[PDB]
Write a protein that binds this DNA or RNA. Sequence first.
RNA 1: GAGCUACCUAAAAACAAUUUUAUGAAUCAACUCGUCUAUGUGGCAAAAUAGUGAGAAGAUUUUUAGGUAGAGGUGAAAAGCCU
RNA 2: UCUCCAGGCAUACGCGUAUAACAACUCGGAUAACCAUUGUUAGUUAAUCAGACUAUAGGCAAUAAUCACACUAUAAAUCACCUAUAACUUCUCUGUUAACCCAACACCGGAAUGCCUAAAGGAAAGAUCCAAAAAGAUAAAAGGAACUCGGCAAACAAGAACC
Lengths: 394, 329, 122, 97, 176, 46
Amino acid sequence: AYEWGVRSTRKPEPRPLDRVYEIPGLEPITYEGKKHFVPWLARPIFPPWERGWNDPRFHRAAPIHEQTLYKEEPCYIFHQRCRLLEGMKQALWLTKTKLIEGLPKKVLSLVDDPANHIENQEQRVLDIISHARLWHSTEDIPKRETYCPLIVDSLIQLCKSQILKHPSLARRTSAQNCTLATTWNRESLLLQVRGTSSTILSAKDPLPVIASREEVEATRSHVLETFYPISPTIDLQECHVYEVKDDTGFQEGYPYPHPHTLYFLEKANLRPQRFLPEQLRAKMLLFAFANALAQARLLYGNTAKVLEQPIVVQSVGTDGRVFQFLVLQLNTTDLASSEGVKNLVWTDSDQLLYRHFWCRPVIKKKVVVEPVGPVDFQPETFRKFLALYLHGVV
Amino acid sequence: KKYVVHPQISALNADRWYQSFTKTVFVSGLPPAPSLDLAALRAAVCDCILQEQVYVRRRRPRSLFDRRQALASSILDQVVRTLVNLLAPLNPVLSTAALDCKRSVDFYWLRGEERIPAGHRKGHIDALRYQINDKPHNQIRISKQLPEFVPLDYSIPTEIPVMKCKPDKLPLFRRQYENSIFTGSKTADPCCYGHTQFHLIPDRLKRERLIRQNQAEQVEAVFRANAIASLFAWTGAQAMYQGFWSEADVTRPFVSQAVITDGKYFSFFCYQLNTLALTVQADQNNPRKNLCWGSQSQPLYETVEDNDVKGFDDGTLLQIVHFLLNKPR
Amino acid sequence: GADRMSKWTSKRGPRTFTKSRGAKKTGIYTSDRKFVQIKEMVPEFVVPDLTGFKLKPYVNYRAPAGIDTPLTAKALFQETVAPAIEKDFKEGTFDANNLEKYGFEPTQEGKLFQLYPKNFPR
Amino acid sequence: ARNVLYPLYQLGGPQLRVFRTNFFIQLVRPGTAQPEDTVQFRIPMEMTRVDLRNYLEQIYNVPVAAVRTRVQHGSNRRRDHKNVRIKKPDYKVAYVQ
Amino acid sequence: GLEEFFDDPKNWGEEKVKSGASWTCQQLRNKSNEDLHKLWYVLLKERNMLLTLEQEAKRQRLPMPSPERLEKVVDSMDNVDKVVQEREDALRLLQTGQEKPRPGAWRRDIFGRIVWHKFKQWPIPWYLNKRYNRRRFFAMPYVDRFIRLRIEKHARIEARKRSLQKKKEKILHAKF
Amino acid sequence: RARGNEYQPSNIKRKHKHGWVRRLSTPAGVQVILRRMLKGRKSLSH
RNA sequence: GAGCUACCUAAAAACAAUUUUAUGAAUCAACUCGUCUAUGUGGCAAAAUAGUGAGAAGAUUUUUAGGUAGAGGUGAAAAGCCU
RNA sequence: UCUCCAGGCAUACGCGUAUAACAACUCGGAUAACCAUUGUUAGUUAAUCAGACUAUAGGCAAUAAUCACACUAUAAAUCACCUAUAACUUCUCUGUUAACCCAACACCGGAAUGCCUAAAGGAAAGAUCCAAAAAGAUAAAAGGAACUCGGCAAACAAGAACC
Ligand SMILES: [Mg+2]
Ligand SMILES: [Mg+2]
Ligand SMILES: [Mg+2]
Ligand SMILES: [Mg+2]
Ligand SMILES: [Mg+2]
Ligand SMILES: [Mg+2]
Ligand SMILES: [Mg+2]
Ligand SMILES: [Mg+2]
Ligand SMILES: [Mg+2]
Ligand SMILES: [Mg+2]
Ligand SMILES: [Mg+2]
Ligand SMILES: [Mg+2]
Ligand SMILES: [Mg+2]
Ligand SMILES: [Mg+2]
Ligand SMILES: [Mg+2]
Ligand SMILES: [Mg+2]
Ligand SMILES: [Mg+2]
Ligand SMILES: [Mg+2]
Ligand SMILES: [Mg+2]
Ligand SMILES: [Mg+2]
Ligand SMILES: [Mg+2]
Ligand SMILES: [Mg+2]
Ligand SMILES: [Mg+2]
Ligand SMILES: [Mg+2]
Ligand SMILES: [Mg+2]
Ligand SMILES: [Mg+2]
Ligand SMILES: [Mg+2]
């Protein structure tokens, strides 16, 4: 079997010890007294050195087996960079959930009412796109690490202007770069999630439940799909030094205990560093599911049971052009077994706000084929964005 | 080659120098000249302070020196977004405004002349060039201009300072690079006017450090220099977007406001632009001049104990609300 | 065509070449590229109070100068240590073990001002 | 102090104190025109701007607000009767406000 | 204040300034350590004023008044320095017996010469310091030829010097 | 083409090719220094 | 002794307008090279100047640092080049 | 003030006081004026421009670029994020001038990148005269390769065919 690492690049073996050391009963004469090396005297052997006090700049870590938090059983941790090979199918298995395509009917209807329409909605949306892609910068072509965050903040500001119609929108706030974690078990596997959110919208009141108890119970017929020979833990980080923690994102006593929506961004300029659509959706489920579970465990303790009051959380993710929407309902905390009542998730995938943008006009033979600005704008996508924001008030 | 002007700078008496570079007169005070549940706003603002300091959970900064500065940035961003949100019903214009975070403002102008002192070009006459490159923490841009604070051609007896030495003696250095005039967005954007700016002072210039360096008298001067440079740049860029330059001077005054905070103390300033004719050629017979009004720094609160903010002052909160409630006529 | 004889300083060479002119360091550089000054590393001038002092830069021409006698280790020992030992020896209360009583120091460790190796400047 | 060794400092060490000072300075008339507050000095090449602040405040009881320094290259162009270059020494200039 | 960097305003423009003699070593020895510490700064401020005046005279292209004042002050400061050194030197001998404050050793360099090496301060012991280990304190056998060449070269210089002295004496005896 | 300009000065190259650390790196270079010391050269290396 | 030149390694950079297409294509600047003629010949220059010419998105040109040394190195072989 | 000409300003590399004022009139500039020369005194100021800038141990990566969307193609193509340990408020040091470098010279030569093309930067004639020969430019009656080794060079031509 080929061994990696050619010998010439490896550190060289220590010099052989002087033969005078072999002879028993003889004291070698070395250059230790001189305090410097000479080629014609024996090489001293020194005992290991101890400073006698701690210098912070030269601290040295103890080995893994000596760590106080070392545990023989392994914990698999899912974090931002993890990219699941099987995509959604693997994500559903880990979270014991059933998938429904399309958004819930209640949320969709919120925007069909023309009363919820914003004034000059289509024109204002077009301006935000142009500002994000061209106008905000002094450069000729801005980069994704700037406009991808910018488009989302501007859209939130547009929707947030609806407080004039609905005074009840003053009961929610938003934070930046909050963190979330949860520990749970699936079929003898210890699993943990460590993550962060770009922005988190929190409300003072819980969201309405989506599915009735009858629908929740009917899920028992559904069976979670498997993907042999690939294990469920492929692409997760195996850790032997870990601590069990749960985190919603705020400490106890926060006036707005109900998280409303979670936002996730793909702002990397280079394509290989950006999650693909399916892998982005898988990340959204686990991160959102962790937020819901941590909130549950907080209220009902560490016991496992089917929840009397299901918890609902929303999630939105984008790279600045394509948008994906998510709604999750947490029905049970008894995840050890693979059979029983299952959680439910609604997904709307690959929603294009615009197809392309030109920062300079396209000229062929002194004819302007394409003017600057968005191409093939689709207003439908924003309405789905607006509907999720309004949910829970209107 | 052009001098580079820093709004936030540690040099002594920078404000007096910036007046000469700009032809601005500074008046201490405020410009000559509906209940909204002030208690509710007090609750909302206190929520913002406590959320970032005591409730949010986020990864600690590595540096250990960015921690204090990073905290102060978080609260100021939260305060601006809420106050702008809460006050939208009373002032409808705030609903259609555009809110910017750490975007760039640029201005380039000519003022003065000098003789080249050495080399093969010795004796030739050259203009003195300046540029301001700035990045305000927050700013609001609207699509309609605000009303004036005093009529154009307003005259007061106070005299602009005159400096004997060259700008170099105030530590100030030159470079050659692109000249830019920028309001925060390109000319194609509809929102071409300014409403208010929010600034956060670097930790290097805060009150405690200055006292140790023995320049206690410079605590207030730092605030003034930041306002004069930042607001002169923003108004000048706005005017040139309307087509006015040194040889076609402004016909209507341009106005804007700013609040400058070091994290706890706050001060308030207003600026009016009357002249873009600052060059030697265009300034030979010009009686106009630019005006700036400012106030001394006042604390907004003192400390956070348990989960309660202690020392909240309503008087300062009124000034922030008054600035945000100004509207076009 | 280069000059071999003039001194090599930081004004010469490309940008990436730098060196000091002999000033002592006053702090440390961390990672993250931040300088951190240390207060104890900055020298402190100990200046006495000069009020009511009778001595001035110059001396009168009528002041008699004295024969030069540089101080030696023998002279210091006789003036300071010899008298005490002589009295105790007459009384008989003297032993070699208690030389520290007369001011002898076995080792310089622990002292703020060590005489060898010197740990303080002028 | 110049031409002397400083004790090496490690975490938790004493303060460094120099009882007798080896630095000598001279006040010079500005060649150019300077602001009214500013003063010029010639200082030894080993002195730092921090040292000048403490030197003036403690020895001379003068309050100082800022300090800036530069190194001036001395000419090495003049030659002696055997055609050997003469070097004018490099020196340091300090501006005190 | 800054006024101490100049002479008494009355003296400005005068051709001469009266001054006394510089401090001798023996007179200083009578004084105590505390007195000497204060006397140092009294001399120091006089030194700065004299250096200031010297430079200003060059700028105005005029002779410096009473330039001998500077030499006296510099001599005085030197005597103060040694007197303090004498006291420290004696005390070190009594307590430690060492003749030098700084540690050192006699070593051979790579060129075959014998030089005194002054030690430096380090936070770690020598056998763990990789920058120090690259320094060599020995000479290899190709240096032996150059050691002989140096010895012979020094021998020629001495012979010529003694020969010249003998010839010069011949001239003196003839003349006188 | 016109010759006479083969010296294209560069301080980094000059110190690496003919400098003090370079001369001491080999025994042949150390003997270069010894010869110039015996002659009495004022400049041992670049 | 490879700061010139020959070849290689690493990190960087430049290429307008027009016609074709989809390219060691075309016209022609920048830039690189050097066909032909005259002037010059201790010359402005120990190989240049003035015109006129070849290539100019490629086996292209250019910058910085490193490598190979004389019984040798390098070479789209001219017994070329290596201050 | 007028007449005419049309690569300038910055950075990198290199150079090392040639920088500025006054004074000199010896030497230097291939001559004067004036200095680039001689002597004396002065100068370049940064937590942002530029350089240097030592916490430790583990775990882990299928998906280019080109307005990156569509779109294919072939030569297959720039630390992050997590897990634990430790520390728990800071500004000193160095570069900064110039008409400048490599070519024996104040050499019609060579010299990387960014912006811009006159708003920046400059002067072909020391005075006079109007010969020969020599060099460069422009115009020419009638004829149009008869010139020459050869349409070399020049031309109101700058096109075609074949070995
Ligand atoms: Mg040569
Ligand atoms: Mg090479
Ligand atoms: Mg080359
Ligand atoms: Mg092209
Ligand atoms: Mg060729
Ligand atoms: Mg061809
Ligand atoms: Mg061609
Ligand atoms: Mg081609
Ligand atoms: Mg052949
Ligand atoms: Mg042949
Ligand atoms: Mg040769
Ligand atoms: Mg000059
Ligand atoms: Mg003159
Ligand atoms: Mg000169
Ligand atoms: Mg500096
Ligand atoms: Mg920097
Ligand atoms: Mg390093
Ligand atoms: Mg310069
Ligand atoms: Mg030549
Ligand atoms: Mg010549
Ligand atoms: Mg010009
Ligand atoms: Mg003529
Ligand atoms: Mg003709
Ligand atoms: Mg004819
Ligand atoms: Mg014929
Ligand atoms: Mg014939
Ligand atoms: Mg021809």
